[PDB]
Amino acid sequence: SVGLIWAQSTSGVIGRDGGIPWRLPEDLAHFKRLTMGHTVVMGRRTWDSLPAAHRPLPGRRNVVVTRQTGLVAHGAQVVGSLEQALSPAEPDAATWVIGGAQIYALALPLANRCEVTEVDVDLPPEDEDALAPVLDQTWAGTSGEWLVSRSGLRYRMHSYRRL
């Protein structure tokens, strides 16, 4: 079963300048805990954004989507489409699409769950930003309480499931 997991600002930004334009350790820990032991599917640009001690993401089957047939991605499985990523030779009980914006758009129609972190950070979008997908009426969700990070940002977790 396919789920998406992402963190966004309220304005809908998920990425900027090849990374994520805020710091939120509670959300990184949330991501690690939900995905550990499972398959994580990502676009090539998100693979390229992973810091060194996280490339590959440890304890998870990393699957990278690219059109570059000869791509070198040590510690990851390279595939040529999202549909390939979602058709493993070796099934996983849980597969998480972990970004980026390009892959979320392709995966959202194939998914039954989205785990969304909302970050109250003032981030008016900039021209090159990666932006969150939008959930339409086929999705319904529940929201956690607004929390404050030890780092100071307000945030909260939403869980959406396909109707």
Ligand X SMILES: COc1cccc(-c2nc(N)nc(N)c2OCCCOc2ccccc2CCC(=O)O)c1
Strands 139-143 and 154-162: antiparallel
Q: Are residues 157 and 117 in contact, defined by beta-carbon separation less than 8 angstroms?
A: yes
DSSP H/E element including 49: helix 44-49
- Cα distance between residue 37 and residue 30, in whole Å: 14
101 among annotated binding-site residues? yes
**Using rule CB under 6 A, residue 56 touches ligand NAP:** no
113 among annotated binding-site residues? no
**Using rule CB under 6 A, residue 62 touches ligand NAP:** no
**Using rule CB under 6 A, residue 99 touches ligand X:** yes
Q: In the complex with ligand NAP, which residue's Cβ is closer, 44 or 163?
A: 44
Task: Give the one residue of 35, 39, 62, 66 binding ligand NAP; rule: CB under 6 A.
Answer: 66
Tokens of 114: 């989205």
- Cα distance between residue 10 and residue 80, in whole Å: 32
60 among annotated binding-site residues? no
Binding site for ligand NAP (CB under 6 A): 6-7, 14-15, 18-20, 42-46, 49, 65-68, 80-81, 98-103, 106, 130
